[PDB]
């Protein structure tokens, strides 16, 4: 970026347009904007594994109820979603979990996908399911 001088000469009429391209400073503008998301992890009411509870709350920052969205979930290495709880959230309207994801057994389901038919823009649509520990590991 320099400060220079231009010198024209002769007959005729022309136009001179100079434009710069750079990386401006974004004031840490909301990198999410359009999807508020609060994830909480709490222990379960005893009655001594670890089985905890995963609660997910989200809201669309738009004027209209966002259409069909997706919930991409990644478990904590050594945790599998409760099968029974998945059936509950699946049978419920406005939510969908492919049969392919269902019968994966406790063995292998570290990655979960919960398809949503809609997400409110006024309040928060929250859901929760149980998770158990089958694979002990430090850190």
């Amino acid at each position: 970026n320099e400060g220079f001088t231009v010198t024209a000469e002769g007959k005729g009429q022309g136009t001179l347009s100079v434009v710069t391209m750079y990386h401006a400073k974004a004031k840490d503008q909301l990198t999410c904007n359009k999807f508020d998301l609060k994830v909480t992890i709490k222990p379960a009411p005893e009655t001594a594994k670890n089985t905890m509870i995963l609660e997910i709350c989200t809201r669309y920052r738009g004027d209209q109820d966002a259409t069909m969205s997706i919930l991409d979930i990644s478990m904590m290495t050594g945790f599998a979603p409760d099968t029974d709880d998945l059936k509950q959230l699946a049978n419920g309207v406005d939510r969908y979990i492919s049969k392919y994801e269902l019968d994966k057994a406790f063995s292998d389901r570290n990655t979960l996908i919960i398809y949503l038919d809609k997400v409110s823009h006024s309040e928060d649509d929250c859901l929760a399911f149980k998770v158990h520990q089958y694979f002990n590991v430090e850190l």
């Binding site: 259409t67 069909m68 969908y96």
Partner: protein
Amino acid sequence: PTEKFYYIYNEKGLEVTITARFLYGKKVEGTAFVIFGIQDGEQRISLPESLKRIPIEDGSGEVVLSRKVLLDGVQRAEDLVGKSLYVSATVILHSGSDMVQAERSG
């Protein structure tokens, strides 16, 4: 689409097949999001009431656009004659790792 066109007086409607396979040939397992719409020269009119979410087993999927929804998309069937329909699919693996957007227009 089963037919390289659409018959206005076709009760069945516009049948479309969603085929998804890995680059190495192997079949793909996932879920697809398919939508429709009408085109007019350069302008496109999306059909929100045609949005479907069909599973993709054996690397194949089946979606249908009922004539009912098509006509309801506008406000004279013989009028739509000449226009074109475009399909916009979006497949997502059951792993949620990759995502591809396809489209058939004309």
